[PDB]
Amino acid sequence: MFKGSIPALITPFTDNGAVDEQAFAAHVEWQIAEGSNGLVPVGTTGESPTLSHDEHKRVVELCIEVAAKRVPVIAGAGSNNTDEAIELALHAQDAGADALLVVTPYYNKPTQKGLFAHFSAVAEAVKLPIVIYNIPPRSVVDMSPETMGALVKAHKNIVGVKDATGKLDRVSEQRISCGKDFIQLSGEDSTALGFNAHGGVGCISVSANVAPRLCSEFQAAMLAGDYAKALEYQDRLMPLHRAIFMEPGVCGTKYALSKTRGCNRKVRSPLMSTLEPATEAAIDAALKHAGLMN
Amino acid sequence: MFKGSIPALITPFTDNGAVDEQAFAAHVEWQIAEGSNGLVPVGTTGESPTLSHDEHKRVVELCIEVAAKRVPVIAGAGSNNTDEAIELALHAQDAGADALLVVTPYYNKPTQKGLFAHFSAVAEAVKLPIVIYNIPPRSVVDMSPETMGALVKAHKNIVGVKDATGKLDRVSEQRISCGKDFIQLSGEDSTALGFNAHGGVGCISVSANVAPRLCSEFQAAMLAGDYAKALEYQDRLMPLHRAIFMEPGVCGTKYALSKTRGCNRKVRSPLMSTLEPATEAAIDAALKHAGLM
Amino acid sequence: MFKGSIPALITPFTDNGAVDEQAFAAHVEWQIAEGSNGLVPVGTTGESPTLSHDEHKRVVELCIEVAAKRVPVIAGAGSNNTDEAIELALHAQDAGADALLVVTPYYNKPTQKGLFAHFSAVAEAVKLPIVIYNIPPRSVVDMSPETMGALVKAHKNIVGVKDATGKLDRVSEQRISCGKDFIQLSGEDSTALGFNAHGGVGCISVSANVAPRLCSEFQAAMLAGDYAKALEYQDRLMPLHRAIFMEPGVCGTKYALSKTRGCNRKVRSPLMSTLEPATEAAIDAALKHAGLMN
Amino acid sequence: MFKGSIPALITPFTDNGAVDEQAFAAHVEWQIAEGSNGLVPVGTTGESPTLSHDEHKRVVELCIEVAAKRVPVIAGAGSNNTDEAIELALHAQDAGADALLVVTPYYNKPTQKGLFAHFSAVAEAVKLPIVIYNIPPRSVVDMSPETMGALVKAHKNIVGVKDATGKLDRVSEQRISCGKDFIQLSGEDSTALGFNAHGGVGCISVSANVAPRLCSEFQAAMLAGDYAKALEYQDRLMPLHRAIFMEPGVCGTKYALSKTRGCNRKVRSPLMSTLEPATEAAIDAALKHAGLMN
């Protein structure tokens, strides 16, 4: 059951740049305590690009262990190399993940038929449910609703999309091509509101790392059909949604958590452990606005 | 009161391309009868670019006459020439329009300061409320929420936006920079649903030309907070929203109305009075899906 | 016929915003004296959007009179309304223009078939040669090489393009679809160099308003096949090409001319009679680099 | 070195998808015989995204062995993970490469400061010359001329750029920020002509895989300043430049070589070993036009 506020978890690092397993476990425990409805370890926000295979696998295992079946674990298994995506998928399945988040291949720019082949190969290799992660702002290519619908028809375990197109009409088009039962989750925090109005049932979220309770209650309001209340949550959260993405979301998020919870700002190159003064100020103002800081 | 479903009215032509005043009047009467909450004569969908000044003026006047104060008339007064926009704004005011729809200057690509100066000059010239029509897909330039907020603060009669950015986070940003009382109207039919969820209160609509009752009921559901019902309308209308824009919306709309109501498909060059076979097929299928054919 | 450095002439205004006929005539005379190979009155750079029909006509007529058949006059006749483009085209023809510059319809976003219909209608109405002005950065729509080739085949008087796509492979594609004898003129100053290497024979130029001699010599170098010399001119002129377009080219150009020749900076709203301080500073440095100021 | 026509070599595979070392060596030997001026193993066109670490390293080693110092080997060493890029750089230097081709990080979208940090770290790690591979159409981020200039100033071994922006004014901007001696190589075949007119000295080329002699002669004409001759080569090659990129360039190139030289079409998912019939028709026509097929 994949719905509600699902953080794309950060991966905390030590000063020496190693995965900080204790900090990661503490973050997961706190996320569950504050109402997060599922967990995505080692997505983009978890710095999947700068983790080795071994580290990727370890973080997935640690997330599964800490969650202890309390909420679903949707493991990142993305790659622009189909064989590598299959390897990550098989590991996550064996480790006990509940589902997989699989990004459209980036950089190499496959055709729609190449996208179909990639996702079909991953779906055929595992029995777990798969959430397609369609993010043209990073991958350049864009899985069409027609390609997505073809995948849904061909593979019973292709069950949903993390839709980061930022084009809300795509939710409507995806309802047509994939069905009303196809699980659509926002890939953008700032438009999670409109996304659910169009038929979405949740958000795989960067902001939830910082404000898990507000984000969970926001999602609950929309699931209950109380869009007036959801708009009030948007009024409280929008400055944060915007501020953490002035620079890379990973870096905005880790700065925010350094202020609220004493989290380490360390990221791996080419991401930077520093931000511009205007970015830090906007994040500070957003945290204060949301009641997370004085 | 500017809210709900507000058609950007087509301008019907006769076979020879002349404005068809009888067809226009009948279209307006029907729009009001079917529940449209306001009217925009000679916006982009009314083929403002290909009307002469006299034709523009006549269609605005005729719209005002037919509406007879039953719903607000928000007259198109757009130009990329500030002097021309002022001329159109003053005429619409003198003719008895309730508000003005003023597009961001297209083609000449002014700066944000130029945008401010353009809208300030129009606002200073008239007493009517003005709705800013921000449409980067046509005008290229994009009025920022900062510029918009500055206009709102500077001019009491800058009251709202027809927001055709297609970026729904902009509604949230405009709510901050312009205030919760700033009137935000979707400039895109296909995302009118999410737009109101973000704080919008209506849509200046192309699709309302074809399905005024359904569009009015869709808007009313959202204004009432019934987003479940609004989604049911989206299920019914989305194929139509998509199909009428496969090619220019004016042409898709006039085709749809040729099928439902026997409207003339004539448009003025460079728009074409024809469509591709896939477009017509999709519009036909969409009309059936919506219960209109 | 149509070749080399062809300024898209500014339209100077007096302090009150009226067309300054004396300043316009002086500018045209100087342009011819300094080596400009042709003249485009009331193009985009001439502030065509903010001139009345009477003013548009008068500036075209004045340009024709001052030129006195010394160089070709390619009159702006652009509109997104086909009927209006025809009216402007016929006036220019009757006035004695040598050719017409006709922009792709902006704002209303016609189809490729609409583009064909528009240009076909203008071509059939006049006997003058027509240069298609393809400028997607302003008009959004983009005339394909296929549509352009179809127009060339259908109308003997469709003779060339002012190509402002900024995609130099389009020159190569247009050579194939329209022929090697199709007259291709750059619509971008900063890439006029590569444009001629691909088969172009000139540039309808904003920068030529400021540096007509240098721009004429730059074009002459390319027409002579001396691309090493042309690159030397590019080294001299590039800072100016860049600086005049940091903000609207009309305003960059009028600022530069205010410094070098005492030209009025007045422009008509929504263009502003000013520039940001960093833009002015960059134009100042560019003029010094080019040897036009000290 | 670094000048002229430098193929971004394909990596041939067997029917079963394994690297075909015999075919790779034959392709390199033929490239050298036909006049290619340098070699880029395991760039994008070499399917770097779908090669394992082992395969990447082995292909770089094989290229170096076969070249036998006859032309420079500019080894692909790209990653969006700085630590991985450093590992690949240290390997390629140890293996005996003459330079490195280092892509801007893709997918994770670093800031300009992140780009500076990434390239600075790679440059500090090796003594070899580094060519920055700036490709916004794949990586989304775009290294500015200012950032590039800062890198050139900070690191003596940052010597050039494979510029795949497709914006020829960028060559002129890079001349300003990086100097006239900065080595600029086109990253696009179809605009290699204009690119050198702006100051480029070569092209890291996809089309050279198919037509190495013609591409080498084209480049030699430009080095000699014979742009009229260079345009004649563009006339001969443009249909091929266009046709191989109707679908992904790797696939178009391997199809072309299957026709001319009996090369295997096999590629790794998400690239497809098949093309649309219209694409194959266009490539065949372009090969005939270029004199490479009857």
CSV table of N, CA, C and O in Angstrom, one decimal, chain D residues 73-141:
chain,number,residue,atom,x,y,z
D,73,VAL,N,45.6,9.2,-27.7
D,73,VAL,CA,44.5,8.5,-27.1
D,73,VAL,C,44.0,9.4,-26.0
D,73,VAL,O,44.7,9.6,-25.0
D,74,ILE,N,42.7,9.9,-26.2
D,74,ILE,CA,42.1,10.8,-25.2
D,74,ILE,C,41.0,9.9,-24.5
D,74,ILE,O,39.9,9.7,-25.1
D,75,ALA,N,41.3,9.3,-23.4
D,75,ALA,CA,40.5,8.3,-22.8
D,75,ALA,C,39.2,8.9,-22.1
D,75,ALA,O,39.4,9.9,-21.3
D,76,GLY,N,38.1,8.3,-22.3
D,76,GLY,CA,36.9,8.7,-21.6
D,76,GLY,C,37.1,8.4,-20.1
D,76,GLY,O,37.6,7.3,-19.7
D,77,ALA,N,36.9,9.3,-19.2
D,77,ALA,CA,37.0,9.1,-17.8
D,77,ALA,C,35.9,9.8,-17.0
D,77,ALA,O,36.0,10.2,-15.9
D,78,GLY,N,34.7,9.8,-17.6
D,78,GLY,CA,33.5,10.5,-17.0
D,78,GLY,C,32.7,9.8,-16.0
D,78,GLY,O,32.5,8.6,-16.1
D,79,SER,N,32.2,10.5,-15.0
D,79,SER,CA,31.3,10.1,-14.1
D,79,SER,C,30.6,11.3,-13.4
D,79,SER,O,31.1,12.4,-13.3
D,80,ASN,N,29.4,11.0,-12.9
D,80,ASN,CA,28.7,12.0,-12.1
D,80,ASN,C,29.1,11.9,-10.6
D,80,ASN,O,28.6,12.6,-9.8
D,81,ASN,N,30.0,11.0,-10.3
D,81,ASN,CA,30.5,10.7,-9.0
D,81,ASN,C,32.0,11.1,-9.0
D,81,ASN,O,32.8,10.5,-9.8
D,82,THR,N,32.4,12.2,-8.3
D,82,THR,CA,33.8,12.6,-8.4
D,82,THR,C,34.8,11.6,-8.1
D,82,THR,O,35.8,11.4,-8.8
D,83,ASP,N,34.6,10.8,-7.0
D,83,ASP,CA,35.5,9.8,-6.6
D,83,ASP,C,35.7,8.7,-7.7
D,83,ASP,O,36.8,8.3,-8.0
D,84,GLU,N,34.6,8.4,-8.4
D,84,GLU,CA,34.7,7.4,-9.5
D,84,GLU,C,35.5,8.0,-10.7
D,84,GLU,O,36.3,7.3,-11.3
D,85,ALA,N,35.2,9.3,-11.0
D,85,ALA,CA,35.9,10.0,-12.1
D,85,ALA,C,37.4,10.0,-11.8
D,85,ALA,O,38.2,9.7,-12.7
D,86,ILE,N,37.8,10.2,-10.5
D,86,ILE,CA,39.2,10.2,-10.1
D,86,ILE,C,39.8,8.8,-10.3
D,86,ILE,O,40.9,8.6,-10.9
D,87,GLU,N,39.1,7.7,-9.9
D,87,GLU,CA,39.6,6.4,-10.1
D,87,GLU,C,39.8,6.1,-11.6
D,87,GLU,O,40.8,5.5,-12.0
D,88,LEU,N,38.8,6.5,-12.5
D,88,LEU,CA,39.0,6.2,-13.9
D,88,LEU,C,40.1,7.0,-14.5
D,88,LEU,O,40.9,6.5,-15.4
D,89,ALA,N,40.3,8.3,-14.0
D,89,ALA,CA,41.4,9.1,-14.5
D,89,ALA,C,42.8,8.5,-14.1
D,89,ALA,O,43.7,8.5,-14.9
D,90,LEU,N,42.9,8.0,-12.8
D,90,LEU,CA,44.2,7.5,-12.4
D,90,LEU,C,44.5,6.2,-13.2
D,90,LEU,O,45.6,5.9,-13.5
D,91,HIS,N,43.4,5.4,-13.5
D,91,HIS,CA,43.6,4.2,-14.3
D,91,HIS,C,44.1,4.6,-15.7
D,91,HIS,O,45.1,4.0,-16.2
D,92,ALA,N,43.4,5.5,-16.3
D,92,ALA,CA,43.8,5.8,-17.7
D,92,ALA,C,45.2,6.4,-17.8
D,92,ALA,O,45.9,6.1,-18.8
D,93,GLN,N,45.6,7.2,-16.9
D,93,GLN,CA,46.9,7.8,-16.8
D,93,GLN,C,47.9,6.6,-16.7
D,93,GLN,O,48.9,6.5,-17.4
D,94,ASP,N,47.7,5.7,-15.7
D,94,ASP,CA,48.5,4.5,-15.5
D,94,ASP,C,48.6,3.7,-16.8
D,94,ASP,O,49.7,3.1,-17.1
D,95,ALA,N,47.5,3.6,-17.5
D,95,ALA,CA,47.5,2.7,-18.7
D,95,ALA,C,48.2,3.3,-19.9
D,95,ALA,O,48.6,2.6,-20.8
D,96,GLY,N,48.5,4.6,-19.8
D,96,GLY,CA,49.3,5.3,-20.9
D,96,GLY,C,48.5,6.2,-21.8
D,96,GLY,O,49.0,6.5,-22.9
D,97,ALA,N,47.3,6.6,-21.4
D,97,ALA,CA,46.5,7.6,-22.2
D,97,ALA,C,47.3,8.9,-22.3
D,97,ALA,O,48.1,9.2,-21.5
D,98,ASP,N,47.0,9.6,-23.4
D,98,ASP,CA,47.6,10.9,-23.6
D,98,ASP,C,46.9,12.1,-23.0
D,98,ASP,O,47.4,13.2,-22.8
D,99,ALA,N,45.6,11.9,-22.8
D,99,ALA,CA,44.7,12.9,-22.2
D,99,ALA,C,43.5,12.2,-21.7
D,99,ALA,O,43.2,11.0,-22.0
D,100,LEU,N,42.6,13.0,-21.0
D,100,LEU,CA,41.4,12.5,-20.5
D,100,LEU,C,40.2,13.3,-21.0
D,100,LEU,O,40.3,14.6,-21.1
D,101,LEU,N,39.1,12.7,-21.4
D,101,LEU,CA,37.9,13.4,-21.7
D,101,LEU,C,36.9,13.2,-20.5
D,101,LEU,O,36.6,12.1,-20.2
D,102,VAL,N,36.6,14.3,-19.9
D,102,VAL,CA,35.8,14.3,-18.6
D,102,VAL,C,34.5,15.0,-18.7
D,102,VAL,O,34.5,16.3,-18.8
D,103,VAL,N,33.4,14.3,-18.7
D,103,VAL,CA,32.1,14.9,-18.8
D,103,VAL,C,31.6,15.6,-17.6
D,103,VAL,O,32.0,15.3,-16.5
D,104,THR,N,30.8,16.7,-17.8
D,104,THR,CA,30.1,17.3,-16.7
D,104,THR,C,29.2,16.3,-16.1
D,104,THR,O,28.5,15.5,-16.8
D,105,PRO,N,29.2,16.3,-14.7
D,105,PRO,CA,28.3,15.4,-14.0
D,105,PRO,C,26.8,15.5,-14.5
D,105,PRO,O,26.3,16.6,-14.6
D,106,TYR,N,26.2,14.4,-14.9
D,106,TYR,CA,24.9,14.3,-15.4
D,106,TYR,C,24.0,13.8,-14.2
D,106,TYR,O,24.5,13.2,-13.2
D,107,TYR,N,22.7,14.0,-14.4
D,107,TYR,CA,21.6,13.5,-13.5
D,107,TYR,C,21.5,14.3,-12.1
D,107,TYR,O,20.4,14.7,-11.8
D,108,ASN,N,22.6,14.4,-11.4
D,108,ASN,CA,22.6,15.0,-10.0
D,108,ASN,C,22.6,16.5,-10.0
D,108,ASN,O,22.4,17.1,-8.9
D,109,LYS,N,22.8,17.1,-11.2
D,109,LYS,CA,22.7,18.6,-11.3
D,109,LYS,C,23.4,19.4,-10.3
D,109,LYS,O,22.8,20.2,-9.5
D,110,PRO,N,24.7,19.4,-10.3
D,110,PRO,CA,25.5,20.2,-9.4
D,110,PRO,C,25.4,21.7,-9.8
D,110,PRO,O,25.0,22.1,-11.0
D,111,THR,N,25.8,22.6,-8.9
D,111,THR,CA,26.0,24.0,-9.1
D,111,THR,C,27.2,24.3,-9.9
D,111,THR,O,28.1,23.4,-10.1
D,112,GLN,N,27.4,25.5,-10.4
D,112,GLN,CA,28.7,25.9,-11.0
D,112,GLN,C,29.9,25.6,-10.1
D,112,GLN,O,30.9,25.2,-10.5
D,113,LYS,N,29.7,25.9,-8.8
D,113,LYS,CA,30.8,25.7,-7.8
D,113,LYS,C,31.0,24.2,-7.6
D,113,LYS,O,32.2,23.8,-7.4
D,114,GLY,N,30.0,23.4,-7.7
D,114,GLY,CA,30.1,21.9,-7.8
D,114,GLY,C,30.9,21.4,-9.0
D,114,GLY,O,31.8,20.5,-8.9
D,115,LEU,N,30.6,22.0,-10.1
D,115,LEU,CA,31.4,21.7,-11.3
D,115,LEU,C,32.8,22.1,-11.2
D,115,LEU,O,33.7,21.3,-11.5
D,116,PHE,N,33.1,23.2,-10.6
D,116,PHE,CA,34.5,23.7,-10.4
D,116,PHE,C,35.2,22.7,-9.5
D,116,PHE,O,36.3,22.2,-9.7
D,117,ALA,N,34.5,22.3,-8.4
D,117,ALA,CA,35.1,21.3,-7.4
D,117,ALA,C,35.4,20.0,-8.1
D,117,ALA,O,36.5,19.4,-7.8
D,118,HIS,N,34.4,19.5,-8.9
D,118,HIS,CA,34.6,18.2,-9.5
D,118,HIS,C,35.8,18.2,-10.5
D,118,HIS,O,36.7,17.3,-10.4
D,119,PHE,N,35.9,19.1,-11.4
D,119,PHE,CA,37.0,19.2,-12.3
D,119,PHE,C,38.3,19.5,-11.7
D,119,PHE,O,39.3,19.0,-12.1
D,120,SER,N,38.3,20.3,-10.6
D,120,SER,CA,39.5,20.7,-9.9
D,120,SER,C,40.1,19.4,-9.2
D,120,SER,O,41.3,19.2,-9.3
D,121,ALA,N,39.2,18.6,-8.6
D,121,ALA,CA,39.6,17.3,-8.0
D,121,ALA,C,40.2,16.3,-9.0
D,121,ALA,O,41.3,15.7,-8.7
D,122,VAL,N,39.6,16.2,-10.2
D,122,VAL,CA,40.2,15.3,-11.2
D,122,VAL,C,41.5,15.9,-11.7
D,122,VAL,O,42.5,15.1,-11.8
D,123,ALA,N,41.6,17.2,-12.0
D,123,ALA,CA,42.8,17.8,-12.5
D,123,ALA,C,44.0,17.7,-11.5
D,123,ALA,O,45.1,17.5,-11.9
D,124,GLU,N,43.7,17.8,-10.2
D,124,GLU,CA,44.7,17.7,-9.1
D,124,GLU,C,45.3,16.3,-9.0
D,124,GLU,O,46.4,16.1,-8.7
D,125,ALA,N,44.4,15.3,-9.4
D,125,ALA,CA,44.8,13.9,-9.2
D,125,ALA,C,45.8,13.4,-10.2
D,125,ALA,O,46.5,12.4,-10.0
D,126,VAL,N,45.7,14.0,-11.4
D,126,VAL,CA,46.6,13.5,-12.5
D,126,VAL,C,47.4,14.6,-13.1
D,126,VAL,O,47.2,15.8,-12.9
D,127,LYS,N,48.5,14.2,-13.9
D,127,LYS,CA,49.3,15.1,-14.6
D,127,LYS,C,48.9,15.3,-16.0
D,127,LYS,O,49.2,16.3,-16.7
D,128,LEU,N,48.1,14.4,-16.5
D,128,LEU,CA,47.6,14.4,-17.9
D,128,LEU,C,46.8,15.6,-18.2
D,128,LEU,O,46.0,16.1,-17.4
D,129,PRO,N,46.8,16.0,-19.5
D,129,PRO,CA,45.9,17.0,-20.0
D,129,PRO,C,44.4,16.5,-19.9
D,129,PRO,O,44.2,15.3,-20.2
D,130,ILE,N,43.5,17.4,-19.6
D,130,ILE,CA,42.1,17.2,-19.4
D,130,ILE,C,41.3,18.0,-20.4
D,130,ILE,O,41.5,19.2,-20.5
D,131,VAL,N,40.4,17.4,-21.1
D,131,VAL,CA,39.4,18.0,-22.0
D,131,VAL,C,38.1,17.9,-21.3
D,131,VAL,O,37.5,16.8,-21.0
D,132,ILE,N,37.5,19.1,-20.9
D,132,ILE,CA,36.1,19.2,-20.3
D,132,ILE,C,35.1,18.8,-21.4
D,132,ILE,O,35.2,19.4,-22.5
D,133,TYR,N,34.2,18.0,-21.1
D,133,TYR,CA,33.1,17.6,-22.0
D,133,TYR,C,31.8,18.2,-21.6
D,133,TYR,O,31.1,17.7,-20.7
D,134,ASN,N,31.5,19.4,-22.1
D,134,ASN,CA,30.3,20.1,-21.8
D,134,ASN,C,29.2,19.8,-22.7
D,134,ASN,O,29.2,20.2,-23.8
D,135,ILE,N,28.2,19.1,-22.1
D,135,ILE,CA,27.1,18.6,-23.0
D,135,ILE,C,25.7,18.8,-22.3
D,135,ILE,O,25.1,17.8,-21.8
D,136,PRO,N,25.2,20.0,-22.3
D,136,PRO,CA,23.9,20.3,-21.6
D,136,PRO,C,22.7,19.4,-22.2
D,136,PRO,O,21.9,19.0,-21.4
D,137,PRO,N,22.7,19.1,-23.5
D,137,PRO,CA,21.6,18.2,-23.9
D,137,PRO,C,21.6,16.8,-23.2
D,137,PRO,O,20.5,16.2,-23.2
D,138,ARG,N,22.7,16.3,-22.6
D,138,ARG,CA,22.7,15.1,-21.9
D,138,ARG,C,22.8,15.3,-20.4
D,138,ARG,O,22.1,14.6,-19.6
D,139,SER,N,23.6,16.2,-19.9
D,139,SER,CA,23.9,16.4,-18.5
D,139,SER,C,23.0,17.4,-17.8
D,139,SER,O,23.0,17.5,-16.6
D,140,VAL,N,22.2,18.2,-18.6
D,140,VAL,CA,21.3,19.3,-18.2
D,140,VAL,C,22.1,20.5,-17.7
D,140,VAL,O,21.8,21.6,-18.3
D,141,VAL,N,22.9,20.3,-16.7
D,141,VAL,CA,23.8,21.5,-16.3
D,141,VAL,C,24.7,21.9,-17.5
D,141,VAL,O,24.9,21.1,-18.4
